[PDB]
């Protein structure tokens, strides 16, 4: 590591919509955000200048009840968002769009879906490339398992841009804990490698600790994932990403998240100090990334990071 370049720039973005949950993704060198607003609305927002602008509300297109699950898949030319209601068949609504502003409506359904027991949550991700096939993943985790049986994590995939979900991805997680709650399973597909970032409840300390597991390609459609250790004393793990083919991990000083730290390959460090709770990475390219949190209501501190190592 002869040459190491690190530089961060702080920017602020204001939003007129109070989002319960935030989902950020970049597309064609532009930052987007799927925002949930509770009449309940689901706005698609694009970042221009110093503020979020609302492009289109897609919840009004279906007229669901309550807050639905959101599965957004970003590709190089198209964006695909699925709104699934929170029976035996999964009822979703698949939206297609080559441009960011206008979306095509289409109601879909999955017969005898495998994720009836599993706890699923919202996330954005990109196609998972296996050989010459590209898959969209709807993943779930069983939120609790009293005694041992073993598909604790399983994803249903689609190689057709989300119209037929008949494909199944096996996730062999040998370290799934009995008698413990799992909360926020999201797949992290950097490059063409599958990874998972979820939460585990520690019943003796009463704390939700994040877990990160790397997956390898054992079989063509079956993966073997094991835990990756990012624990460091007196600091709570937050988010994980990859820059320069190296892990960049966000930490918090404590569970109050008064100040956030970012470590590059577990050696270099940057201290972020405004509450930075809810901060998440948005990878722009292989050497740039974003760090977005909301220190107060109606604003978003975005930290643009450049990391390099020759």
Author numbering: 1 to 38, 45 to 92, 99 to 161, 164 to 288, 297 to 332
Which statements did the authors publish about this structure?
PfRh5 forms a complex with cysteine-rich protective antigen (CyRPA) and P. falciparum Rh5 interacting protein (PfRipr). The PfRh5/CyRPA/PfRipr complex plays an essential role for invasion of P. falciparum into human erythrocytes through binding the receptor basigin. CyRPA displays a canonical six-bladed β-propeller fold, and the inhibitory monoclonal is shown to block formation of the PfRh5/CyRPA complex. Within the β-propeller structure are four intra-sheet disulfide bonds (Cys19-Cys35, Cys90-Cys92, Cys151-Cys169 and Cys229-Cys239) and one inter-sheet disulfide bond (Cys274-Cys298).
